[PDB]
Amino acid sequence: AGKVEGKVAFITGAARGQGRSHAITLAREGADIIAIDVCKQLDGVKLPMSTPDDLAETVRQVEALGRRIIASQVDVRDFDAMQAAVDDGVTQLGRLDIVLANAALASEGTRLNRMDPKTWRDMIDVNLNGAWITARVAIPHIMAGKRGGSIVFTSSIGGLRGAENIGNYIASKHGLHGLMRTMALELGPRNIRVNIVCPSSVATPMLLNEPTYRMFRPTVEDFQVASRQMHVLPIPYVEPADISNAILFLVSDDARYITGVSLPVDGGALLK
Amino acid sequence: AGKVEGKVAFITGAARGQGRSHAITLAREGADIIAIDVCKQLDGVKLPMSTPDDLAETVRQVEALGRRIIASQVDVRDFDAMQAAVDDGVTQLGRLDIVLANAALASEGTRLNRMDPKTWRDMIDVNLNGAWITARVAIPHIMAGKRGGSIVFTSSIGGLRGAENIGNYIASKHGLHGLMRTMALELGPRNIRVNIVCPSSVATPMLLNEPTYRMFRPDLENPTVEDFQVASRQMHVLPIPYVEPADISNAILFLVSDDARYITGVSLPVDGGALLK
Amino acid sequence: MAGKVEGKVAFITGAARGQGRSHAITLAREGADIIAIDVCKQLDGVKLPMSTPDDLAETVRQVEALGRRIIASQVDVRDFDAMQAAVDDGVTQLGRLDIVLANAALASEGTRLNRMDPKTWRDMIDVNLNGAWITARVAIPHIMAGKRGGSIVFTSSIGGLRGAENIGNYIASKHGLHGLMRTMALELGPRNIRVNIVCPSSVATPMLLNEPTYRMFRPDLENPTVEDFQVASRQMHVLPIPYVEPADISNAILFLVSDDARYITGVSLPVDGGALLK
Amino acid sequence: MAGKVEGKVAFITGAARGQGRSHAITLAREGADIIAIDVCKQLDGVKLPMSTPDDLAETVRQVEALGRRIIASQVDVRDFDAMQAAVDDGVTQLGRLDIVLANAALASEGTRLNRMDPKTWRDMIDVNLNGAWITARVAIPHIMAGKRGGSIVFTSSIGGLRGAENIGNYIASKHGLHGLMRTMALELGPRNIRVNIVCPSSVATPMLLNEPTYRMFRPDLENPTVEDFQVASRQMHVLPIPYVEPADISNAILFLVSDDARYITGVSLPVDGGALLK
Ligand SMILES: NC(=O)c1ccc[n+]([C@@H]2O[C@H](COP(=O)([O-])OP(=O)(O)OC[C@H]3O[C@@H](n4cnc5c(N)ncnc54)[C@H](O)[C@@H]3O)[C@@H](O)[C@H]2O)c1
Ligand SMILES: NC(=O)c1ccc[n+]([C@@H]2O[C@H](COP(=O)([O-])OP(=O)(O)OC[C@H]3O[C@@H](n4cnc5c(N)ncnc54)[C@H](O)[C@@H]3O)[C@@H](O)[C@H]2O)c1
Ligand SMILES: NC(=O)c1ccc[n+]([C@@H]2O[C@H](COP(=O)([O-])OP(=O)(O)OC[C@H]3O[C@@H](n4cnc5c(N)ncnc54)[C@H](O)[C@@H]3O)[C@@H](O)[C@H]2O)c1
Ligand SMILES: NC(=O)c1ccc[n+]([C@@H]2O[C@H](COP(=O)([O-])OP(=O)(O)OC[C@H]3O[C@@H](n4cnc5c(N)ncnc54)[C@H](O)[C@@H]3O)[C@@H](O)[C@H]2O)c1
């Protein structure tokens, strides 16, 4: 009997990286999956974004574990598309227990006094408004099940402290802590727990790119020596599995009374 | 000589309430003022918003103190119009030292699992994106003055904790804390300090209205301001139902004065202890 | 099949009953041997019944029923020399030390800070904060000597993160733990020793479930019962529960000391039914 | 004008020099009379020279030059009876008590928490945390008796909000203040007594400007100068400064105890040049 046996989880940004890792982790532990990813290169985004074939690979991996998955290409900003995806997913699978609001854009990096309004607005829209949309379309289905459930937003240590050059990302992530606290207060009586995980740096294509290395100074090793200095434990970053394992704890029975919390998985970065 | 003698402050939502109080407090203490307010009833807001006459009253009170004020009707969401208003104010007045990001919408009250996406997004746009716009159009003029400056965002005890029914307002206010910390880090080396004040409840039209009394007293049919004050006093630790606009202006005056020259990146509650419980 | 702390040794203070017992049995179920201490006597001026030697003997029985070794002794966490002796003799017997759970504490007598005697203040700080430091201090040399890293968890409280009337000595001591935890996490992190805090709200143990506590929670009633207490306590939480179980705290600790939490350090993890949200 | 604290009386610990002296003169300039104490002795295990009786007389000279009254004496904040006698005697002589600034403290010598001996840990907690409680405890009855409310300000540190290696006893002690402050704010708020904390980063006093502190800031350097320290200290601030002046802390405190801050309580106000941001 897996830790989430028979449950259904809705996961955004499931085509690669942490989102994929959560999908396979929860599936391995007995959950069926409603997965979305935008699967397209958004205007103004520099590095390669997930493709449909990436999402199809998440699908093949979940199915290999013996679980069902309903996947679609949806932008978290498109309220009607998000509503249709979760609605169709619950129709297929019969329930909804867990929501992992994980989809996000990383900052291109501009001082806030230099940034133009579209660059600020789009980041807030994906990372904050899209996170609210994700929970908003899913909650009615969790409530209909009458068994409680779990919502986890992925924030960042930049949800708890500032950083130069990425202020739009930083503000979007701070906003998630407000969303998390209200929703935890509103849904507590329904036994739906709402928490945040705050990674420092995670080995995914969001981090492991030439533009990021430059922002830390350059090879990956050049980057790793500077990344290590940000951590207290002797690591450059954590693995997607570390975030998935924290999330697995939070959605399990063992964490039944934990709500309203922001859990850093950051090798001690917040300490300094 | 006053605490902000010879300086210039840009203040949003200056038509009434805390914005007007800030204008007159800083004007009393020697500053000239660039004042904006939307002065229009925005689609989806039920309570009466400030009028053009309201902004003209702020002007009259500032001019009565012998200070100069350049006022205009500008939505904080409107990047080009905000750019123009601050550019023109700096042209007329000569410099910019202080930015008070004060304009905001109150939440009408709707559970996050029932809220419409426009209701959610408009609130973020005014309260968070508009606050960013406010700072962004002003910073270049503060930078060019080469004397440093101060930027103060008005958050809320709702920027530091959640509350039922007003989660779009909560999220928007929490977002300011990250905008403030980033901007404090980026501008600190040029002696521009960036801080937040977090009021609990403030005696302005945003608080003192029947829909608010109902939200505080959902147990009663037609709650009065007195019924509201009972509930409100219970939220505070000091024996008060709310603070005055002047209490916020006084905290702001301290933060922008030489007495707070090395204070940056802080969130200062003015909340009668409400955050303690 | 290996449990989550298979082959490890945990030093647990306040192990005679309540949360400390629960941690001892949870970690033993998951493959750890235990060094367990508790003062096992009614301390001067403490008005709630403290653990007895029989209580500690019961923790021992339950740990040994799980097929694990336990070295248990009656030690006051304030007594540096005896704490040092206990841990040293325990490591001599078991061969290593991996995990430290600084759990022992006294609950507050409930006096306003402006009426409190200096002895009442000092003793609370000495047990809950200084004794917590002593606990880590005597253990860390053994963890380092093992060259495998390790885990230290202090038990704080939601009262380590916010204040409460009437219990301010306890509140101060618990706040102090967050500073202890942070420095220690910084100092020991390069050696792969993770250091964290758990912050329970209210936990179903004799520290909570006593008439003086029910009276403190219901100043509106003349003689409150446990049920009157549960009513108010449920209103203080966001999930509608009056308290968590010792097992909920043990399960959070088990996560934190396990490989699944290998890169978590410097955190305070509330296990609080959302109490901190309001 | 009347000053911002006209006619009020402030009890200030650690008044012989540095910040405590700056508070006393600043409040005096703004109309307050002063009850000042300082231990005025070299305490055992403290390496750098501490305040002397002559330092305290110099604070007295400055307050009296501003035309105010000051009752000054040599008291250790850890000494409950002596602390009670000082404040009782000061109130007898000056007529009332409105403001308490718990400012006295020891700076950590610098030892890893896994190597520190128990006296080194305990003495630091006893001065910085217990002594701060004693300070508020002996003063509160006089403030309450005035029925006019008042203000209590504890001086913490950015080390009350985050950890640092080598100074763990200091860090724990300052974190404990935030607990003391919160409970006291909750207990005294219905009486209109506000209770707050100020958190300086580094302040230009003998506690900061000394060769052992220089060495702590530049452990990379053989015999670091004050300039070498200022380079590293500036790196840790966000504003282009190496420290704040005692007057910066006094000015924040003046704000907090003035009518302009009448509704601010329970808050921790960093005066830190943005050090906490990174
Ligand atoms: N990678 C890091 O170091 C790091 C650190 C802290 C927090 N985070 C956060 O972790 C979460 C996961 O990111 P990751 O590391 O897996 O990065 P990633 O880029 O590998 O994965 C993010 C996924 O989200 C998808 N996505 C982006 N915008 C979307 C939209 N509008 N609609 C739908 N899908 C969209 C992308 O296509 C991508 O597949 C994000 O919240 C991110 O901010 C990442
Ligand atoms: N009143 C309270 O109890 C309370 C509590 C916590 C925080 N706050 C915050 O205090 C600040 C001041 O509010 P107040 O109490 O003076 O309320 P108010 O309604 O009296 O003043 C706000 C002003 O902002 C203006 N405004 C609103 N939207 C605008 C836009 N898009 N562009 C330009 N101007 C706009 C309004 O016309 C109004 O004049 C706000 O940030 C509010 O969120 C208020
Ligand atoms: N019960 C609650 O509601 C609650 C809530 C928040 C935090 N806590 C904390 O949880 C932890 C465990 O408490 P509990 O709920 O198991 O209470 P408990 O009283 O049942 O257990 C505490 C144990 O600590 C022991 N102890 C006390 N002083 C000691 C000393 N000087 N030396 C050695 N042993 C000593 C007692 O004998 C007792 O066995 C403590 O840190 C407590 O402060 C408890
Ligand atoms: N100086 C800094 O850089 C710095 C930084 C952060 C916080 N702080 C805090 O600021 C406060 C003031 O320190 P300062 O910088 O003025 O240092 P200082 O050493 O110049 O002043 C401290 C004064 O307190 C007195 N004192 C010490 N122990 C005492 C005791 N047991 N009883 C009575 N008096 C005693 C000393 O004799 C001295 O006169 C302290 O709380 C300190 O911990 C200082």
Author numbering:
A (entry chain D): 2 to 218, 224 to 278
B (entry chain B): 2 to 278
C (entry chain A), D (entry chain C): 1 to 278
Please quote the paper that reports this structure.
With the exception of the M. thermoresistibile target which did not contain NAD, all other mycobacterial SDR target crystal structures contained NAD, which appears to have co-purified with the protein after expression in E. coli. For each of these crystal structures, the adenosine mononucleotide portion of the cofactor binding site is enveloped by the inserted residues and only a portion of the nicotinamide ring appears open to solvent (see representative examples in Fig. 2A and B). In addition to the insertion loop which covers the adenosine portion of the cofactor, a second loop which typically contains two α-helices covers much of nicotinamide mononucleotide portion of the cofactor. In contrast, this loop is ordered in each of the mycobacterial SDR crystal structures presented here. The combination of the insertion loop which covers the adenosine portion of the cofactor and the ordering of the second loop which covers the nicotinamide mononucleotide portion of the cofactor results in a significant decrease in the solvent accessible surface area of the cofactor in the mycobacterial SDRs, relative to other NAD- and NADP-dependent dehydrogenases. Only a small portion of the nicotinamide ring appears available to solvent in each of these cases, indicating that the NAD cofactor is tightly bound and potentially non-exchangeable. The structures presented here have a cofactor solvent accessible surface area of approximately 18 Å2, whereas other NAD- or NADP-bound dehydrogenases have a cofactor solvent accessible surface area of 82–89 Å2. Given the encapsulation of the NAD cofactor by the two loops in mycobacterial SDRs, a large conformational change would be required to release the NADH cofactor after a redox reaction had occurred. To test whether or not the bound NAD was exchangeable, we performed a number of line broadening and STD-NMR ligand-observe studies, and did not observe exchange of NAD/NADH during the timescale of the NMR experiments.
Here we present a series of TIGR03971 SDR crystal structures from several mycobacterial species which contain an insertion in the primary sequence at the NAD cofactor binding site. These crystal structures demonstrate that the inserted protein residues almost completely cover the NAD cofactor, only leaving part of the nicotinamide ring exposed to solvent. NMR experiments did not show exchange of the NAD cofactor, whereas binding was demonstrated for a number of small molecules which could be potential substrates, products, inhibitors, or artificial redox partners.
